[PDB]
């Protein structure tokens, strides 16, 4: 049987990723593949227990660490459409630091405050450097009006930015109101210098973005959902210092075994 040979990014695509801190590949997965991922996401929301977050409404907001519990999601992170590019960009073997599905229901979502993901991973999880990235799979078309991820392009180039801390514990690392949000003034400067961009794309697209790029999103006023599957790949050399870790495995992985690609089988 045959998997399609590993595809990697072009030099131009790599350059664009390093400069901007994000990159969209359209139509990586087809509709049937997206429907399978959507059905598995629904199962995870229903059966995820303590791994599930909820929104004012008690409506499901997020589920975490699904690659450890779902055979489908365990295979997805090894996909030949994903793993080769993560290896290319991080210039290493890689593993999954974090996995989450963020629902942003039609008419329903919440405001994710400005943040850098690395700030959490560094301070909560002991990630020593920002040699990590996230792949966001669009389960639905992402538009202007359904609460797209919004970035400051080039905003990753200064590194970790000083952030207000709010409360001990980790409960508020997954909430609308975030543990590390960005100085109102620091953001103004960044945006005045670099601007703001919300990448769009059809269902089945993949949005790659740097661990350190500032991002945000608003509620969904469209009649259409905005499901994102977010896979955070980390360089194996950049494995986190488990002695400085504070969160469970379904938020911050502790098995640093290098991922290998999915091969074709008869089942
Ligand atoms: O789903 C969103 O709009 C925000 C996701 C995010 O930035 C995060 O979970 O860190
Ligand atoms: O706590 C975490 O790791 C994720 C990434 C930043 C927001 N929540
Ligand atoms: Fe984030």
CA atoms 96, 100, 101, 107: torsion sign: negative
Resolution of this model in Å is: 2.1
User: Is 102 marked as binding a ligand?
Assistant: yes
Domain range for 28 is 1-267
Residues in a beta bridge with 163:
182
How far apart CA 109 and CA 2 sit, in angstroms, is 41
Spell out the residues 6+ positions from residue 45 whose beta carbon is closer than 8 angstroms to its own.
52, 60, 63, 101, 103
What is the number of the ligand 2 atom nearest to the C-alpha of 170? Answer: 1
How far apart CA 46 and CA 70 sit, in angstroms, is 13
CA distances from 110 to 177, 228, 239 (A): 10, 14, 32
3-state secondary structure of 147: coil
Ligand 2 pocket test: pick from 63, 101, 118, 121 the residue with the most ligand atoms within 8 Å of its Cβ: 121
What was the structure determination method?
X-ray
User: Is 210 marked as binding a ligand?
Assistant: no
Atom 6 of ligand 2, residue of closest alpha carbon: 117
What is the number of the ligand 2 atom nearest to the C-alpha of 112? Answer: 7
Q: Ligand 3 centre and the CA of 47: distance in Å?
A: 24
Find the helix packing angle between 83-90 and 11-20, rounded to 10°.
70
Pair of tokens at residue 69: 């519990």
Residue indicated by tokens 């690395």: 118
Strands 132-138 and 228-235: antiparallel
Spell out the residues 6+ positions from residue 253 whose beta carbon is closer than 8 angstroms to its own.
68, 95, 96, 97, 98, 234, 240
How far apart CA 117 and CA 90 sit, in angstroms, is 16
Contact (CB, 8 A) for 245 and 255: no
Pair of tokens at residue 87: 């290896």
Q: Ligand 1 centre and the CA of 8: distance in Å?
A: 25
Pair of tokens at residue 10: 């072009």
3-state secondary structure of 123: helix
Ligand 2 pocket test: pick from 98, 134, 212, 246 the residue with the most ligand atoms within 8 Å of its Cβ: 98
Q: How many domains does the chain have?
A: 1
Spell out the residues 6+ positions from residue 160 whose beta carbon is closer than 8 angstroms to its own.
116, 118, 119, 122, 130, 212
How far apart CA 38 and CA 53 sit, in angstroms, is 17
How far apart CA 25 and CA 41 sit, in angstroms, is 21
Alpha helices in 146-237 (DSSP H): 184-194
Eight-class DSSP state of 90 = H
Pair of tokens at residue 181: 């949000």
């Amino acid at each position: 049987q045959i998997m399609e040979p590993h595809d990697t990014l072009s030099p131009a695509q790599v350059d664009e990723y390093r400069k901007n801190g994000f990159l969209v590949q359209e139509h990586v997965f087809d509709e049937e593949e997206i429907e399978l991922l959507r059905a598995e996401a629904a199962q995870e929301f229903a059966s995820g227990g303590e791994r599930v977050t909820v929104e004012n409404t008690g409506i499901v907001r997020g589920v975490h660490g699904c690659h450890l519990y779902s055979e489908v999601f365990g295979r997805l992170v090894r996909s030949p459409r994903l793993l080769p590019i993560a290896r290319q960009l991080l210039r290493d073997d890689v593993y999954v630091h974090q996995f989450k599905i963020n629902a942003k229901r039609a008419f329903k979502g919440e405001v994710w405050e400005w943040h850098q993901d690395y700030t959490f991973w560094h301070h909560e999880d002991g990630m020593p450097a920002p040699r990590a990235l996230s792949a966001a799979i669009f389960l639905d078309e992402v538009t202007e009006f359904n609460g797209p991820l919004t970035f400051v392009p080039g905003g990753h180039g200064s590194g970790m930015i000083d952030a207000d801390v709010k409360g001990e514990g980790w409960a508020n690392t997954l909430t609308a109101s975030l543990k590390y949000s960005l100085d109102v003034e620091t953001m103004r400067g960044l945006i005045e210098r670099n601007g703001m961009v919300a990448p769009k794309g059809p269902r089945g697209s993949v949005l790659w973005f740097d661990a350190n790029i500032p991002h945000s999103s608003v509620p969904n006023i469209s009649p259409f959902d905005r499901g994102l599957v977010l896979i955070t790949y980390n360089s194996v050399e950049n494995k986190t210092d488990v002695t400085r870790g504070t969160r469970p495995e379904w938020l911050a992985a502790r098995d640093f075994t290098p991922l290998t690609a999915l091969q074709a089988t008869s089942f």
